[PDB]
């Protein structure tokens, strides 16, 4: 489908509530494999298992290795914009 931009609100004591797989070294996007119930990703209601995370807060993750992408994602705070597309 189309690119969507979705806002997630994460409190400082919370994680994002996603499992992510993929990355440049695998020739696939950064992908959401699980959405954990009640955590910020679930609450925003705009993200699905199978979504590729193209960018977070304007950080392009289309050509980044797994670990680096996870690091960038885990550094995000507050109101976080995900640019996603369903694969």
């Amino acid at each position: 489908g189309p690119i969507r931009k979705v806002l997630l609100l994460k409190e400082d004591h919370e994680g994002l509530g996603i499992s992510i797989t993929g990355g440049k070294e695998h020739g696939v996007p950064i992908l959401i494999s699980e959405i954990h119930p009640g955590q910020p990703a679930d609450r925003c209601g705009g993200l699905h298992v199978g979504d590729a995370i193209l960018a977070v807060n304007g950080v392009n993750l289309r050509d980044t290795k797994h670990k680096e992408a996870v690091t960038i994602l885990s550094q995000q705070r507050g109101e976080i914009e995900f640019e996603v597309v369903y694969v």
């Binding site: 994680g15 797989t21 990355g23 695998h26 696939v28 954990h36 694969v87």
Partner: peptide, 15 residues
């Protein structure tokens, strides 16, 4: 539907 490379068993992180 079907076979997407992005569905294959790959290293995963929980965040």
């Amino acid at each position: 539907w079907x076979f997407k490379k992005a569905n294959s068993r790959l290293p995963t992180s929980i965040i």
